Amino acid sequence: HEAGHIVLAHLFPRFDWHAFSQLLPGGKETAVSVFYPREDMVDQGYTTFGYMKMQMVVAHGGRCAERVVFGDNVTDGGKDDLEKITKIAREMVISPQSARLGLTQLVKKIGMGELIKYRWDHPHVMPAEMSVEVSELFTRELTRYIEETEELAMNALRANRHILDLITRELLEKSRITGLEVEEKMKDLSPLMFEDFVKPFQINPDDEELLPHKDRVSYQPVDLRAAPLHRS
Amino acid sequence: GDENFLSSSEITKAQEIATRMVLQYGWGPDDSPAVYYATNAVSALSMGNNHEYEMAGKVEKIYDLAYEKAKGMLLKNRRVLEKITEELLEFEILTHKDLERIVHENGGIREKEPFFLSGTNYNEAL
Amino acid sequence: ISETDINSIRSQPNMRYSETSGRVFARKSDYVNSIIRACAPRVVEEEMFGIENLCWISAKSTLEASQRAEFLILQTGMTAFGKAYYRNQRDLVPNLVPKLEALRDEYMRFAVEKCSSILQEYQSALEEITDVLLEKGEIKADEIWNIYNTAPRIPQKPVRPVDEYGALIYAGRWGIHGVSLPGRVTFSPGNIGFATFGAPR
Amino acid sequence: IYMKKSYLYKWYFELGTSMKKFTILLYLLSCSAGSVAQDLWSLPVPDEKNRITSYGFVENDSDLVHGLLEVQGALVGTLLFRSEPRDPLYMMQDGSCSIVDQRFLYETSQTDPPTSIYKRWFIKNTQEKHFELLIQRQRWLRTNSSLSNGFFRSNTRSESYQYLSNLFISNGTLLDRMTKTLLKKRWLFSDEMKIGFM
Amino acid sequence: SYKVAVLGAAGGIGQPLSLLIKMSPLVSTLHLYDIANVKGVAADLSHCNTPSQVRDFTGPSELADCLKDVNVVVIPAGVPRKPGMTRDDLFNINANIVKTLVEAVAENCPNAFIHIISNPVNSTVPIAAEVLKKKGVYDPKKLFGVTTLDVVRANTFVSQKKNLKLIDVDVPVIGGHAGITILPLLSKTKPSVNFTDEEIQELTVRIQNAGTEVVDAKAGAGSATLSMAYAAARFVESSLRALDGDGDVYECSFVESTLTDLPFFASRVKIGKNGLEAVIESDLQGLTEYEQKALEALKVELKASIDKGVAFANKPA
Amino acid sequence: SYKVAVLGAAGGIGQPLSLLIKMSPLVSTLHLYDIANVKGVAADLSHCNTPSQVRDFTGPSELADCLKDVNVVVIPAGVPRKPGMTRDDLFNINANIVKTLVEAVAENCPNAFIHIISNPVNSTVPIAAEVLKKKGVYDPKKLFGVTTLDVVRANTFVSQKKNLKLIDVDVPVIGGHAGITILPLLSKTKPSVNFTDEEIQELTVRIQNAGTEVVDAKAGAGSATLSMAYAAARFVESSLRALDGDGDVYECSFVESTLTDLPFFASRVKIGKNGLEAVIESDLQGLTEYEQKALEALKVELKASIDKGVAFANKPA
Amino acid sequence: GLSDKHHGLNNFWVADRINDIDVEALRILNMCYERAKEILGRNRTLMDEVVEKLVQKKSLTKQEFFTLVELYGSSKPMPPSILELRKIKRLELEEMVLKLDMTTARNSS
């Protein structure tokens, strides 16, 4: 589990700094890694979709490596991951910048930390009145995003297994690893590098040029309703 | 292209008035003595779950009946209304005598007793 | 199971287990077995003593099975309900409620049938352990396993295995219609005509 | 280009007493135009990888548009081609609410056994949390099944976005030079707006 | 809960038209009828899981029992185009078929909506009117000419050229249903879009010759059989909505109206429970010089077509 | 916003199926293809005011351009029944046509949904499977056999007999799509209704012989052309919804399943984004002795049909 | 949890089962109601006797009330307790398991 988390953390060009990772901390039958987000993300004050996808891919990593190695008998060791992913996935759909559910009345304010702010869990946020079909779109989107990050995690963790069991053997032998050791061990291994997710879209400061559009907004209006039944 | 939010404070008053004959006083569409509300009441009765749609339809019926009565007896004095508007715009003061003169010269038609929203159940006193 | 006594009245059985730490992992089969073990007293009292002889306590045993099955469906994520983690309070949108109810009912059908099938095969061992408990009032693990391995077994008909899609097939947004899609060509809204089979136009 | 550090909804409504119904459309158009420019000027084809979810002003813009739409729909009781569906329980609910507002403004198995059969075997307050739980669940199911007024606001915002896109596309050079100016000089005023409108 | 009788539901247009009528949420019973091959169509449509019942009648002997309780009479019967054969003989055979069909309707059900499809409908609707007059049961408010194909083609071409959303586009069409007589009112097209002169010219000729384009594109295999079924189904559902009491049944039909000197004219009408309720008077004035000269050009040809129809419908036996 | 390619859209089944596919709210591009008479079908379908565009391709030379970016491949190709023509030559012609078409789709677009409509689909789905195997592009989760017509017929007959409202009535159907192998599961019919013995007997024989009743009702005019198009359109719409991401896409198809010893079997399946996602395993447990011996009788016939299909599909060139 | 609708299951999620929860209580009251009618209709003579005694004396103890019950009572067949049910189930189980024993033995030997 820890080795899969470490591998999917260090398969990315611009993930958080891996401080260390310890198995069985103080006799508890668990394991823990420490990741420190970069200072630019803190200074930004917001999160990007690429960065949250960063988070659910890395959070999938442990259970994904467990399922890859041990097989299809999946345990509940990554339950917190299965929670955290879902929470961040909900911020993917609740947000007003979603292409499918941007212009719809999602969670509304009754009337009145961390890098990722869960607007769903606000004390003044109580879910708005939905239909049956609108909620089905919500469930479909959350399932789509969870399955996309899931497929990315599986594909990455079969892409490089040698680094996985190398970090694993380090985790048995030392019972504690550090980010410098992790970086120096895959330095001469040449892993399949992931693409950068959080590279900022930027404008040239003084290059006089008409930068283009596609030519449209990407929002699609919410109109899903079946035709009326027969015998009317 | 030019609408108003002026009559809204009246229209909700109509939304207040109609339900009073349906819940409180029993002056419903069928003259039913069913009473579900009192002057000192805090809430209503059990009211059912699908029974609310029926009385809601009743309340919309009496509201629309009053609306259509007002429309029928207001669209027949269109020119009188235009006259009153322009006299009000050009004089800025009008009295009851002036309104009487306007509705007399321009042909205002008044309503006649007995006044009912629906004549299908009206009766005469003894 | 280590020790067993009948000297006390409790909401839960007075059984004692040999606790071994190390529960890092628990499979779906472990959750199913826990659900089956949860609703034992109601099944045994309904079998030997009938429905009209249930206690107020032993009938309050399938409720814990209900809580455990809802935990398995919602907060574990190896069922066909999805691969998300829902906290029972409010992140349950009205589309997933019929799916949760149908999966829960299917799980209780499977669990109750398995409880009724297991106990009727080991009836001789059941009554032998009951008689030994009635005589002594304190029984040990070794004699429990001895009676388990030595008592005769009546063969029973196999139970029907649990499947989630077979119960979710009739729990959708449209309902029962959507499995038998009639299809309709409608020209009324707008200036266009659409022939749909359950699809939203 | 420096980050700012909130209750403009109440000011516009408390200042507008007898205003027209057409200025609501203009307010909604102005409160939903930044997302149009963002979607236009951000380069196509990431898998939504470069959006700015859950930040400062987009939440206030969404709340303002939702409030404007609710105000416009609740007061509909030519300008508009059609009207809101008007759920057939809103009328009597409004009437009862007005009546109540005017009224307001006008001022565990019973462990002791029963020796007499007349007494009950259960206390009245034993199963009371389950009654409230079932009532709350049923009320939640009833309330979350009758919002027939959710598909109307979405398409209205869709047409607003389409008009904003069509208006921004032709005058794209204005915002292009203006963005170049904002990247050039850090601070920016409305006199520079009126100068750079050329 | 209405009843629709298709007269000629085993030909080219008839089978897809019956297929579309069956699957509507308004039809509950349906009589298919043709001189032959109507058993198989009813057998095929009897397996679809839609609650609209299907019964069929074969031959003139059961045509008397076909038109009981009928609210809408659909007449798509009529031979498609064949090699080596001219306009005159097709006019005679289609006219004779529609005479027999409307005479059967007048004998059985005077009170049913009559939809005439057979070509040329410009000279066929007057024939139906005359044979309804001869029995004293002519109701001019319950006899339509299906001319929705021109409107559908106009919407398609306008939305393809100006790149507009297809559902929102609807283009008024006046005149008739044969070549030059179809005049699209491109200056009254909603949503509002500004057209040029060449675009209007090319759209007008494309709308007027689209049927010719299809019948040469088929290489003599017949005429339009799927778009015709689409337009006929749209008009049938509109007429059924009119029978429901719906207060905004606005269509484009070829009916006996008095907008111009012509007795029969295709324009926007508003249909009610009893049939024709109003004719939209906002279509015939406000036109530019293009639509004016096109209208005065097509007026004489439409008059000639209507005169040919009314003269052929009054020939002695 | 998906692309559908109909291979053989100018025959009997093809034209109504293409017309019904055009009226779907999810199709955005339609690629008609047949060896001949496909220009006229495209001309007919290019005038409907539906935003689903229509393009046609003629001949195997342009078949390579027909399958670009196609998500759903529909194969209703295959000549209808001819007088004097036996079973083996019909199977040879239809199997050769579907073999060439499956070779073409394997060469061009191997990640597209494949729907087989040609009769018998019991011995045609294995042919497509073997041909896809020969190119190394076979996906068992993206290859279906359309047997929806049996389900529709079962629902219609059961609602007609038991006087249930036809909208909710669904009857599970297992086996295949040819005569005796179609077994309706009348004991698992919703809504819950109690059946007698002779009612189940007559309903089962009627469901099994409705096809031959259709073909003898037409008096040798072909096969079912409106109900088959109905079932194919229903399955195409369900497959298109499956690509849209709906999590409750359940159908009845003849696919490669391991629920029995038979490699291919018609049963209730659940379709996802990547094709087949689940197979309803509970359909075969809970049967009475009637359905048990019916399955035992149909197993050998279906095995023979599948063996004949695989035997033809691996014949040397 | 004492009912037998599915198996106890005092809580559900959908509104249909929540509505059906309160249906079983009213049917249970109805069946108790008809049972009370049958019980009181079986005992009319003792009913009249005990009513007369209650009016004349205004009080009654166990002995005289039970004496009147024995004088005018109807048949009250007592349902078996749990001991008799356990005994009959035990003897049925023993006879069935020995039947299984012989059907194994004499078919094998």
Coordinates of C-alpha atoms in Angstrom, one line a residue, chain D residues 30-155:
Chain D
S30 CA -23.6 41.4 -16.4
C31 CA -23.2 38.9 -13.5
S32 CA -22.6 36.0 -15.9
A33 CA -20.1 37.5 -18.4
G34 CA -16.8 36.8 -16.8
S35 CA -17.1 33.0 -17.3
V36 CA -17.9 33.7 -20.9
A37 CA -14.6 35.6 -21.4
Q38 CA -12.7 33.0 -19.4
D39 CA -14.1 30.1 -21.5
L40 CA -13.5 32.0 -24.7
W41 CA -9.9 33.0 -24.0
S42 CA -8.7 29.8 -22.4
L43 CA -7.2 27.4 -25.0
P44 CA -9.4 24.5 -26.0
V45 CA -8.8 20.7 -25.5
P46 CA -7.6 19.9 -22.1
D47 CA -9.7 17.3 -20.2
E48 CA -10.9 20.3 -18.2
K49 CA -7.4 20.4 -16.8
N50 CA -7.0 24.2 -16.4
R51 CA -10.1 25.4 -14.5
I52 CA -10.1 27.5 -11.4
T53 CA -12.7 25.7 -9.2
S54 CA -13.8 27.1 -5.8
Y55 CA -12.3 30.6 -5.7
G56 CA -13.5 34.0 -4.7
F57 CA -15.9 35.8 -7.1
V58 CA -17.3 33.0 -9.1
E59 CA -19.3 31.8 -6.1
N60 CA -20.8 35.3 -5.5
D61 CA -21.6 35.5 -9.2
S62 CA -23.4 32.2 -9.1
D63 CA -25.3 33.2 -6.0
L64 CA -26.3 36.5 -7.6
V65 CA -27.5 34.8 -10.8
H66 CA -29.5 32.2 -8.8
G67 CA -31.1 34.9 -6.6
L68 CA -32.0 37.1 -9.7
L69 CA -33.5 34.0 -11.4
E70 CA -35.5 33.2 -8.2
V71 CA -36.7 36.8 -7.9
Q72 CA -37.7 36.9 -11.5
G73 CA -39.6 33.6 -11.4
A74 CA -41.4 34.2 -8.0
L75 CA -42.8 37.6 -9.2
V76 CA -44.2 36.4 -12.6
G77 CA -47.6 36.1 -11.1
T78 CA -43.8 41.0 -24.8
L79 CA -40.8 40.5 -22.6
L80 CA -40.7 36.8 -21.9
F81 CA -41.7 34.2 -24.5
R82 CA -42.9 31.8 -21.8
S83 CA -43.2 31.8 -18.0
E84 CA -42.1 29.5 -15.2
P85 CA -44.1 26.3 -14.7
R86 CA -45.5 27.5 -11.4
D87 CA -45.7 24.3 -9.3
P88 CA -49.3 23.8 -8.3
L89 CA -48.7 24.0 -4.6
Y90 CA -47.0 27.4 -4.5
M91 CA -50.3 29.3 -4.6
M92 CA -51.9 27.8 -1.4
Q93 CA -48.4 27.7 0.3
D94 CA -48.1 31.5 -0.3
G95 CA -51.6 32.1 1.0
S96 CA -51.0 30.1 4.2
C97 CA -47.6 31.7 4.6
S98 CA -49.2 35.2 4.3
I99 CA -51.9 34.3 6.7
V100 CA -49.4 33.0 9.3
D101 CA -47.2 36.1 8.8
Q102 CA -50.1 38.4 9.3
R103 CA -51.1 36.5 12.4
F104 CA -47.5 36.8 13.7
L105 CA -47.4 40.6 12.8
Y106 CA -50.9 41.1 14.4
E107 CA -49.6 40.6 17.9
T108 CA -37.0 0.5 27.2
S109 CA -40.3 -1.3 27.6
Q110 CA -41.7 0.3 30.8
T111 CA -39.7 -1.9 33.2
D112 CA -42.2 -1.4 36.1
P113 CA -45.0 -3.9 35.3
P114 CA -48.6 -2.6 35.4
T115 CA -50.7 -4.0 38.3
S116 CA -53.8 -2.6 36.6
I117 CA -54.6 -3.7 33.0
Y118 CA -55.7 -0.1 32.3
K119 CA -52.0 0.9 32.2
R120 CA -50.0 0.4 29.0
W121 CA -47.0 -1.9 28.6
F122 CA -45.0 0.8 26.8
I123 CA -44.1 4.4 27.7
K124 CA -45.4 7.0 25.2
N125 CA -41.9 8.3 24.6
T126 CA -40.1 5.0 23.9
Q127 CA -40.3 5.0 20.1
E128 CA -40.3 8.7 19.4
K129 CA -36.9 9.2 17.6
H130 CA -37.9 6.6 15.0
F131 CA -41.2 8.4 14.3
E132 CA -39.3 11.7 13.7
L133 CA -36.8 9.8 11.5
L134 CA -39.5 8.3 9.4
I135 CA -41.3 11.6 9.1
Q136 CA -38.1 13.4 8.1
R137 CA -37.2 10.8 5.5
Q138 CA -40.7 10.9 4.0
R139 CA -40.7 14.7 4.0
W140 CA -37.3 14.7 2.3
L141 CA -38.5 12.3 -0.3
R142 CA -41.7 14.5 -0.9
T143 CA -39.8 17.8 -1.1
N144 CA -37.0 16.4 -3.3
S145 CA -39.4 15.2 -6.0
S146 CA -41.3 18.3 -7.1
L147 CA -38.8 20.8 -8.4
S148 CA -40.3 21.3 -11.8
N149 CA -38.4 24.7 -11.9
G150 CA -34.9 23.6 -12.5
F151 CA -34.8 23.1 -16.3
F152 CA -36.0 26.7 -16.9
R153 CA -33.2 28.7 -15.3
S154 CA -30.5 26.6 -16.9
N155 CA -31.7 27.3 -20.5

